[PDB]
Amino acid sequence: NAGVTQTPKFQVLKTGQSMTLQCAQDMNHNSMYWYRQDPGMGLRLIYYSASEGTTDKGEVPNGYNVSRLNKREFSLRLESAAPSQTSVYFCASSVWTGEGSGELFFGEGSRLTVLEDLKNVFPPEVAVFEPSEAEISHTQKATLVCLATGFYPDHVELSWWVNGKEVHSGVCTDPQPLKEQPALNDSRYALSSRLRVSATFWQNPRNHFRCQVQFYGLSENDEWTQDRAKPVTQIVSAEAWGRA
Amino acid sequence: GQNIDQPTEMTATEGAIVQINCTYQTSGFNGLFWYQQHAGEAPTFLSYNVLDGLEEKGRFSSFLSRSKGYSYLLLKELQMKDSASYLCAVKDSNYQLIWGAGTKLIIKPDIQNPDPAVYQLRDSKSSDKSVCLFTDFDSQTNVSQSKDSDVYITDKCVLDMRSMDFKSNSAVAWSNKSDFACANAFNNSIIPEDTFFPSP
Amino acid sequence: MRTHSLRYFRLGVSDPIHGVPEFISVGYVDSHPITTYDSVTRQKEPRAPWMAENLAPDHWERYTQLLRGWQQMFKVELKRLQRHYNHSGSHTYQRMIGCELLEDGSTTGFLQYAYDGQDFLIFNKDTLSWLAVDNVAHTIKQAWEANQHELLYQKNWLEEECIAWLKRFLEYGKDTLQRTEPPLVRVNRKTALFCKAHGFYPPEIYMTWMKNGEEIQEIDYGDILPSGDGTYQAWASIELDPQSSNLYSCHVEHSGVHMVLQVP
Amino acid sequence: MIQRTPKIQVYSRHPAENGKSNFLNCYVSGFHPSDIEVDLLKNGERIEKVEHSDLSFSKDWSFYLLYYTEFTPTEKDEYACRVNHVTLSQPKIVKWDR
Ligand code: NA
Structure with missing residues (x-):
């Protein structure tokens, strides 16, 4: 089926x-x-x-x-x-x-x-930001943020992985990307996601958090002449560990 | 010329009812379809009407008036999972499907215990960005895009912590500017007066 | 206007002799062919000059595609019927759909199927159900009636779309379809009296014999037959009593006019 | 299976008058299934310049066809219509009767 x-x-x-x-x-x-x-x-x-x-x-x-x-x-x-x-x-x-x-x-x-021209193609830069200690003490919850920035075109799939398994509960990823330069028609994009867990879960030092962004870009046969790395299809990720 | 019209966007509150209208001017009529299309996904069939009247399918009903050339899709007991675009399409006399441009439906969650705050997240040693989180505000709050070119602000997003049956709104702001601070990150939005700003 | 109708027929044949199409579909307005399609040409084409004049190429291209699909659908359906009848050899499958717009402004609409030239399934658009003549048809009825949307779709098509198409075609062909050629009528002696009418259009005509003011039962009615020029002819005959004379008279009704020929 | 044999009717377009150009019609109808052969005959010989309508469909599921040819009738010339169909053991001939 x-x-x-x-x-x-x-x-x-x-x-x-x-x-x-x-x-x-x-x-x-x-x-x-x-x-x-x-x-x-x-x-x-x-x-x-x-x-x-x-x-x-x-x-x-x-x-x-x-x-x-x-x-x-x-x-x-x-x-x-x-x-x-x-x-x-x-x-x-x-x-x-x-x-x-x-x-x-x-x-x-x-x-x-x-x-x-393929020189407008950029992979995303991925970074994870650990929760605010003030949020933990005020709400007993902990929000991690992942940012995927500078990518073009808008060919990305962002996922969160907790202890090696993909998660979706507690996750919210922007449904549309943000144009980093709204005026330009070829502007690079930014995408933000958050993962919220209980303070107790965040405070376990052996919980592992990873944000993964799959980018669909160039293939092997595409010609590349720029000085930077060829922006092929690729996975970019960033991680954090729980904090005791 | 044949034409199908539906509103671009509708916003309603969790638990409530929304009526999405479709009006058509076509050369003949062989039926009207509604499809649902979640963001990034394929349209899937919802309903078909061809005689006059109301037809119910669970929480969704669809109505047709052939003489007035309109249909509506009625969604009751709205849930966050109803957030999607709704596409109407009409079969004309030659059985050609004419598609409306779609109505994006935005659902406001019912926030039981608002606790608006702007938090500074911990810097990453592999990023030059500082990142601020505006969160736990009631759904009537709107988040404005940035008015500084080196500050980036994403729209509000609803997250669901299923294990605690808990929902919250949030929006993210970031920048690598040296003078960027979370106390001023959302200065272009109208935020609740009681918004909590923890001391730096 | 007089009464008018629009109808489309389909004919499928399971094991046709060489050269003969396995599928044919022809449309009519009243007695006039308007469109044709078959599995040999694989094109929908006009059959009346006033159809060719008034329908642009995009109409024939679009319906050509649909007819190629309906052709395949007809083949699959005939294959299913013949497998369920457990029939070998060549058999036929037929469909007729259409509508009438009556003089008084009311309408009718019909959809039915036949296997080997006999009624098979008959749609009732008022009860939204299919009448089945045997248990093969009953199996199809159950499958078709399980898809209630498709029943509603046919009701809309018969009551609204069909009538709109008919009105459109009636305007295209109005100089042909809405004209009147009254009949030329005479009584021949051959002992039987023959009432003979010819040269008339439209083909609908009522002829009868009256005896001393009472309708004869003992009337032999001829068919309404095409003369080949777009008009029609017909006759009706009565046998004379050799022992007693009677006041015989032919009565002809055509397009709102009544005619009486008294035989002296 | 019910196969229906063609009704066969031979008649002129206009009332026939010797020496006056006319059309001889053979109307074949009510038959099922649809394959059929029709010829017009003059003194028993087949006529070559014969036209015919496309196969036509009746509401009762049978078919009909009109075959015709231009002709000038005479007192001597005999005309007929010869029809073959699966229902017929051998071709049936119907003579024009004026
Ligand atoms: Na092309």
């Missing part, structure tokens, strides 16, 4: 590069769709495939094409990537098309950023 499976989850492209997005559904559905989602507007259909063996353009087909490879699989191609094609792409399927009540089932989304 996988549902709709699309890849890649994240991708950086240089203007003019070509790329293929893959989508498979294992629900024995007949209709498949490729959408893009952009801020401030409704989903726009790029191409669709009403049944195995046929396809047709949607509302915004220019710059793309598709292959319905078989009943399961519906590929989307970017012929020659342009910055206007920076978007989140969703594959979807339904049992049929042109029936009435049948709903769509969506893939997880593919976040693509198209850049004129």
Whole structure:
């Protein structure tokens, strides 16, 4: 019961590069769709495939094409990537098309950023900040803060790990990043998260806290000419121990 | 031209009720869908209406009036997990799905025992930043973005300590400026008069 | 306006002889073909000049895609029926959907299926249920009725969308569809009296024989037949009593006008 | 399986008058399933320039078709319609009766 499976989850492209997005559904559905989602507007259909063996353009087909490879699989191609094609792409399927009540089932989304130059790509800087002693004494609780800063594009996944296991209770991570320079259109981003635990838990000297940020950046074949380190896909983390 | 309209954003309080409106002007009508889309996730199906009237699905109900060209999605007994965007979509005469731009629903938690305070977190030896935490304030407080270019302030976030059935608001401010201090970090926000500032 | 209707048929065949399509779908307004699609062309195309004139290419492209899906769906459904009937060989599957806009402004709407040319499932959009003629149909009824949204969708389509399409097409084809050509009617002697009408449009026509002011039962009614020029012809006959004369008269009703031919 | 045999009707477009150009119609209807062969005959010989409507669908699930040809009737010439269908052991001939 996988549902709709699309890849890649994240991708950086240089203007003019070509790329293929893959989508498979294992629900024995007949209709498949490729959408893009952009801020401030409704989903726009790029191409669709009403049944195995046929396809047709949607509302915004220019710059793309598709292959319905078989009943399961519906590929989307970017012929020659342009910055206007920076978007989140969703594959979807339904049992049929042109029936009435049948709903769509969506893939997880593919976040693509198209850049004129890859030198705008930066990995995040990650730092953890231990709780305030005043908070501990005033509330009997302890908030750790993780900051992931200076990254671009907004391709990050932040997680907290307590004693080697990922946690989510007590966690709040900003749902959208902060533009570090709100005026600039290519601004680098910042993201903050907090983990709040009881004072007693924080005061155990063998509890271990780590904030981990997965960044999706460049791949091996991307060309890199800047003086700083090549910003490939990578994990950056920072840690703290409980304080007795 | 075909058009689907829904509000950009709605804010309501935990435990209460919200009605999200969708109005459509389409060439023909073959049904109206609501989808829920959590931040960073895929839209998932909520409801379908095609004749007139109200249909209930647990805490959510959906209404349709074909003659007036509108629908609403009614969410009762609001919980923090209802925070999401809600997308309406209409099938036109040619069975093409026309999508609304979505309504982002923001839920204010019911803070039982507000204890507003601004705390200085401990510096990290691997960072030149100082970090301030504004926390435990009631949900009517709004956090303003920074007005200094070298100060960064994130919006309020609701965390849930499930084991203690406890919720709190908080916002983070940071900077590497030498004159940055937590006493003034949130000076551009209207914060509660009783906000606790521990001595440096 | 007189009464008008819009209907779409589908025909699927499970093991067709060579060259013959496994799937065909044709739309009509009244007696006029308006659209056609089949598994050989794989294109939806107009069948009336006033459809081609008034529907842009994007309409035919969009419905071509839908019809390719409906074609596949029809194949899967026929495969399921024939497996459940435990039938070998070639069998047929048919669908008819449509609506009528009556002269008085009221409407009707219908959706039904057939297997091997016999009723199989009949939709009731008032009770929102399917009538099944046998236990294969009963199995499908149960599956279709479990998806109550899809029943509501068909009710909306029959009552609102279908009627809107019909009104649109009636306007496109109004010079054809809303015209009147009255019948030319005569009585021939052949012993039987033949009331013969021809050259009329629309095809709906009422012909009968009256005897001394009472309707004859002993009337042989001919079919309404296309003459080939867009008009129709028909006849009705009565046998004469060799022993006693009677006052015979033909009665023809067409598009609001009544006609009487008394046989001297 | 119920197979329905075609009704076959042969008639002129306009009332027939020798020496006057007309159209000979063969209307084949009420048959099921849909495969069918129709020929128009003149003195027993098949006519080559014969037109026909697309297969048409009736509400009762049967099919119908109109075959026709332009012709000028005479006192001597005999015309007929020859129809084959799965329901028929051999082609059935229906003569035009004016
Ligand atoms: Na294209």
